Swiss-Prot record, chain B:
This is Small ribosomal subunit protein bS6. GO terms for biological process: cytoplasmic translation. The chain holds residues 1 to 100 of 135 of the full protein. The keyword Lipid biosynthesis does not apply. The gene is rpsF. The modification N6-acetyllysine is found at residue 93. Keywords: Acetylation, Ribonucleoprotein, Ribosomal protein, RNA-binding, rRNA-binding. Part of the 30S ribosomal subunit. Interacts weakly with uL2 in one of the 3.5 A resolved structures. It comes from Escherichia coli (strain K12). It comes from the Bacteria. GO terms for molecular function: mRNA 5'-UTR binding; small ribosomal subunit rRNA binding; structural constituent of ribosome. Binds together with bS18 to 16S ribosomal RNA. 5 different forms of the protein, varying only in the number of C-terminal glutamate residues, were isolated. The sequence shown is form bS6-6, which is the longest. The first two Glu are encoded by the rpsF gene, the other Glu are added post-translationally by the RimK enzyme.
Curated annotation (Swiss-Prot), chain C:
It comes from the Bacteria. This is Small ribosomal subunit protein uS15. NCBIfam families: S15_bact. The gene is rpsO. Keywords: Ribonucleoprotein, Ribosomal protein, RNA-binding, rRNA-binding, Translation regulation. Belongs to the universal ribosomal protein uS15 family. It holds the Pfam family Ribosomal_S15. One of its GO terms (biological process) is regulation of translation. Induction: Part of the metY operon that extends to pnp, also has its own promoter. PROSITE patterns: RIBOSOMAL_S15.
From Swiss-Prot, chain D:
Belongs to the universal ribosomal protein uL2 family. It comes from Escherichia coli (strain K12). This protein can be partially replaced in vivo by its H.marismortui (HmaL2) or human (L8, from the 60S cytoplasmic ribosome) homolog. Residues 27-52, 220-271 are annotated as: Disordered. InterPro entries: NA-bd_OB-fold, Rib_uL2_dom2, Ribosomal_uL2, Ribosomal_uL2_bac/org-type, Ribosomal_uL2_C, Ribosomal_uL2_CS, Ribosomal_uL2_dom3, Ribosomal_uL2_RNA-bd_dom. The modification N6-acetyllysine is found at residue 241. Residues 38-47 have a biased composition (Low complexity). One of the primary rRNA binding proteins. Located near the base of the L1 stalk, it is probably also mobile. Required for association of the 30S and 50S subunits to form the 70S ribosome, for tRNA binding and peptide bond formation. It has been suggested to have peptidyltransferase activity; this is highly controversial. Keywords: Acetylation, Ribonucleoprotein, Ribosomal protein, RNA-binding, rRNA-binding. The keyword Lipoprotein does not apply. It comes from the Bacteria. This is Large ribosomal subunit protein uL2. One of its GO terms (cellular component) is cytosol.
From Swiss-Prot, chain E:
This is Small ribosomal subunit protein bS18. GO terms for molecular function: mRNA 5'-UTR binding; small ribosomal subunit rRNA binding; structural constituent of ribosome. Part of the 30S ribosomal subunit. Forms a tight heterodimer with protein bS6. It comes from the Bacteria. One of its GO terms (biological process) is translation. The lineage of its organism: Bacteria, Pseudomonadati, Pseudomonadota, Gammaproteobacteria, Enterobacterales. It comes from Escherichia coli (strain K12). Belongs to the bacterial ribosomal protein bS18 family. The chain holds residues 20 to 74 of 75 of the full protein. Binds as a heterodimer with protein bS6 to the central domain of the 16S rRNA, where it helps stabilize the platform of the 30S subunit. GO terms for cellular component: cytoplasm; cytosol; cytosolic small ribosomal subunit. Keywords: Acetylation, Ribonucleoprotein, Ribosomal protein, RNA-binding, rRNA-binding.
Amino acid sequence: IKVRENEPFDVALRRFKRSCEKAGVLAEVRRREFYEKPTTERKRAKASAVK
Amino acid sequence: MRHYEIVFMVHPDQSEQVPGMIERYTAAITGAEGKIHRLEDWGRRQLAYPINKLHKAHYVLMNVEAPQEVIDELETTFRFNDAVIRSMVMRTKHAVTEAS
Amino acid sequence: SLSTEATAKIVSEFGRDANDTGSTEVQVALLTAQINHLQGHFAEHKKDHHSRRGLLRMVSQRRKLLDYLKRKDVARYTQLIERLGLRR
Amino acid sequence: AVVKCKPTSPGRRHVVKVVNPELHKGKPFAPLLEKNSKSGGRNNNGRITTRHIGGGHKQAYRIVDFKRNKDGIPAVVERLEYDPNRSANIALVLYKDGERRYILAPKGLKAGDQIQSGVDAAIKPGNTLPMRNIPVGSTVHNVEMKPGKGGQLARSAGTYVQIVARDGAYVTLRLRSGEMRKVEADCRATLGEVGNAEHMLRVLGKAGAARWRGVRPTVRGTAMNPVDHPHGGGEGRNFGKHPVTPWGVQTKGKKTRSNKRTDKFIVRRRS
Amino acid sequence: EIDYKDIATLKNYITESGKIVPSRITGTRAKYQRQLARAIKRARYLSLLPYTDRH
RNA sequence: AAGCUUGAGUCUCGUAGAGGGGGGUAGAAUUCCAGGUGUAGCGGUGAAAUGCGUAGAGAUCUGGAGGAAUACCGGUGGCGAAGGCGGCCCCCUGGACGAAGACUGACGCUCAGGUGCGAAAGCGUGGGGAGCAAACAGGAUUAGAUACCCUGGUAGUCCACGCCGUAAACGAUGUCGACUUGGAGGUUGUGCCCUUGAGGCGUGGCUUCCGGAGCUAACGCGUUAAGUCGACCGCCUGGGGA
RNA sequence: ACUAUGGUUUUUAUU
RNA sequence: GUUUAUUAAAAACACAGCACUGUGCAAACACGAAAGUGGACGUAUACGGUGUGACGCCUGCCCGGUGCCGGAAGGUUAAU
């Protein structure tokens, strides 16, 4: 990726590249690893903004 | 019947004729067997934009219980009168009486 | 839909005991009063198909009840039409 | 109301008619029936100048009240009637004091109903309440803009003037001509719409009805001899030229105006 | 959904130009935003908040 | 010809919704008109030209005129039998659901014939005309073109009132009845949280993805089934011709 | 996401 | 229905309808040295003028030219 910018910022957020596909796919989706770490531990992670 | 707050913006210099309007607003709901719970004051307030060369308007608020099959025919009273703009009936929203 | 006033006026007529909400007669009378509450909401313009289908749905349920009442008891149907608004 | 019938006999095909059971079946109120006498249609030389002019049978007029000024006196509607000159209809009214008068018909009001006059009257059609008391969007009926001239504006079936902008002592009227006329609210203003709003339902029908109308058909210039129409001919069927009137003048694309003296009264031109 | 007359809360979701601030930059949820916009619309019709700065 | 009940229904107080029908009322960007301030470019592409100005366009300022959908929120979200349905505000309305009592007493299901209903365009009388646009004047294009591309643009989309009944009308799954097997999200009630809490852990409704029994040539369907058979209807028996 | 072109359209082969 | 009174009665003339074009009402229009007269107590589906002919189903191509209107600068050009 690619994809054209629509909100101007001079510094990147590392939000869309290599984090994001390489790695980011087919390793967390649907019950992979599970136990508590990809869902329940994050439901117990406090946030001062939504999330 | 349903609860209505009934809010409308009155010209601030007509505040001495408003008691004469309240006199016949009360008659137009008590003749319909409805009930009033405030109908006294919400003060003269500053607007977010000027109108009719002024920057304030007077607010009364009615806070009533009325038959909603005539609540639009009752709205004609504020619409023929030149002293009033943008009248709106404002239904329920946890009204000031609640069958206590 | 039927008002609290119009509901009570049926339950206090098409009964035989104190507050008796089941009799087949009161089921048919309430459906006929729901057609009186339909006035001013049906037959204004060709653009609405809902309230004629609502009338036909209440009429379908009223037929399902009457077709049974006049087969099981007979006399309770020919008597109900003398105190309910039907045909005339 | 309107009534219509399918074919039944030779030449009696599909037909349409307009009918009103609430129109008075009797005679006009005789004190207010006036002959509507005509000077004869002769020009300054004692001869007729207008081609094929005629009709109707008598055209006698039912006066109509356009000079009334009344306050606090109520009145009742007695009739719905016709006048042979117009499409507006008339209503016979009885004042409760009292006098019988013909009013230019208000719509939304029938016989056996009561109206008031002037400042203590409600905002209902026919109540003639002051035009300086009513909001924009009100339908004012027949206007009168020159005091004492008579029933100016809204003179045809289902017509009305509407008030669209107030300026203190003044108000602007939205006209059927597309105009934006201004006045100091000193108008007769009966309140409502004119007549019964069914004159458009008419069809006239058969060509023999043109004799009652007093109107004789226009003829094609090609269908004349060369001495009684400029287009007259001529088995070639063609004029070799742009089309003209029987007087030999062109008019297509040729705009005509003579008024130069209402420039302060003109406000808006129709789109 | 409950109030439109006390404007102290509604001024927290509009700019000095009277324009509505997106939920994605206020830590606010969208099912709130959808009704905070209704409270702002109610308070605009009350003439106690501005519609547009044209005006 | 009567009785019962776990089918199927009645009444009271609460839960969510762009479902439908009617009235009250604001915005954003685009388009024309008048006079100012008055200038040489303004328009369109993959490319190019018609357009548009020297008789003064485009743009900008204050007015006047005017149409269509309501943009953001809008979702791996609601609601509707479906086709479809989003600015606020007020009434009326078919279904679905929480929950304590009391009443019917098999009142249930399907359906030939019949009958109800448009995303669309077509019939048509009078209004409307900014987006977009078949038709259409042109620019072209090219060897050619009637097309791709571009300037302008009618029917039509919009309004009142009626006819037409169309489609891939695809949710690939007739309408009804009672069963089967786990996980995880969303959405809405409800019990309890000194609410890590765009909630949590159970329990009712809806629903989406993954997945098991069974069924399938294959896709997979997968409790809302392409499974299990029970009611009733519609329809079939090599392909083309049709 | 990172730079335009559009047409002609094999016959015997297989004994 | 109107039509060659005495050789010619039809297939011509015209109606709801389609379209162009003049008219916002002191209208347009016709007539008028002048008073005015009609249009008209009508008011845009109402009025004036010309094509085409109800109904049903359609509406080719052409603006070089003559005519007509718009664009208004310039030229020639009379009163002055």
